[PDB]
Amino acid sequence: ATNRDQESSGFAWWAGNARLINLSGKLLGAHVAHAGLIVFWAGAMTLFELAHFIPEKPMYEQGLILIPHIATLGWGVGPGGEVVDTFPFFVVGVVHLISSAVLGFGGVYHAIRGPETLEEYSSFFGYDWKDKNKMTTILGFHLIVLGIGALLLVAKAMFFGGLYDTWAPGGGDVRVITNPTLDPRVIFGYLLKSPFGGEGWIVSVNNLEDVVGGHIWIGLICIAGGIWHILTTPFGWARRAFIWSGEAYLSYSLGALSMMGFIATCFVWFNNTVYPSEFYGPTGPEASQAQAMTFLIRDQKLGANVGSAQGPTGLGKYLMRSPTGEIIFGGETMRFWDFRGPWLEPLRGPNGLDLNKIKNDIQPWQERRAAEYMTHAPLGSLNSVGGVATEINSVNFVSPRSWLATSHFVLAFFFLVGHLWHAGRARAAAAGFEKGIDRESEPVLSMPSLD
Amino acid sequence: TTGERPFSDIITSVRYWVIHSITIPALFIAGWLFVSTGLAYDVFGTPRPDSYYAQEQRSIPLVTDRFEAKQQVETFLEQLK
């Protein structure tokens, strides 16, 4: 039983997987088996959601997070995001579940049956962490794989049905993308936008052309980069900047994933293009705006002139100006004037909300949508009591946006912590004092006093 | 050590489990029945779901007199017909 106790390995049971660092075969096993866990949950969770799914209820009233992902890809839904066929959901679930058996098979094999190290078995599959060439090669392989994935999204969008477009003219619908955005000024344009209000960095992408073109770019970039890293080896400056060891690489990736986690938190919280509100429920900004819209409509029906109605503070009760002058909804929702949504934009003119359009052009479907979104705001308790914290039990509801955002903030945080942990440790181990200070060679004792 | 038998010894011994595979379920069932027979309600004076209010009453039976409190509660209970 090689390296399977503290004495031989140096690692206690609670750090047991650290015993795998230089056992590439077993480590392979751990990784493949874990991939199997991921795929397993995707499939099983999908089948669970589908069993618990009532087609004529909004997805977001049913605690669904995966079916919305499938539906966004254009599978199983029609105009307005109405479910017209569940079978694609069923397929996604079943095929993932079946695939997890394969992955788990390979993982268990490599983990407790196969060659514990791969280097004597195969020079192709074996590796040394310190071998910069091989490391960048495997990195290359996987970059090519990722690019291929992004290109699969592109292919879905352009050649196999299209995507769900909440912005489609005449109403949200599945649409084939025929003219993806290829101009780098726009694509990287997003990358150089401020993350602050009214800008929102990449989180602000608001049309499917930009999304598809983005994935075209990312796909080519990843494939090119992958080839590049297969054919090259780190340059001198890189060599001198980094720690080259398993734990170091792990730490780099932990940093990356923490970053991605925070980004996804903001994506699901603000964006309603790749997270359509039809499936995920309205955003916080969206529901606040929707309340304003709802009472503007009600009161104006009762005969109120909403353009001239002065509220208690002196600001408009229904309508006011943004700090740069655009006409926007009044009350606290003044904070959310950067919100943009298919049900509100027809009332928007060049200077913002248009009073004539507001007076004459509001359709019943808009009233409906604003009422729906206002009454499904992403607020709710841990035991899934919908509404403000003072609300009485009655409505079983917490928004998918809340679930997704909170879960991924938590994970991104602990992953930042993990990055600090493993980076600090990788530095200490590479320098050789990760186990403590050498009593006979205590560095501070050879330093001059501070005073 | 302080002279007692190690817990590791005891709880992994056959005899321990011969004893406690009887005594633990016995206790569990006893408590179960303490609730299911309704005895708990009567021992502790806790209202059953139908004994918080009389049918058309909506006023809490709050105790308002220190020394005749006992009689107050008794009257309150009679008020459930």
């Binding site: 400056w237 001198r240 900047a241 720690i243 530095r427 320098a431 560095p443 | -």
Partner: protein, 38 residues
């Protein structure tokens, strides 16, 4: 305000550059024990 903005932009860029180039300047080697970490 424009002079203020330009000034701050130049300052921030200066310090950021110091940070990056500094950590690029053989930092793993800047420890008491094993210096050869390239």
């Amino acid at each position: 305000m424009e002079t203020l903005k330009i000034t701050v932009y130049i300052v921030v860029t200066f310090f950021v550059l110091l940070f990056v180039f500094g950590f690029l300047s053989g930092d793993p080697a800047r420890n008491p024990k094993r210096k050869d970490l390239e």
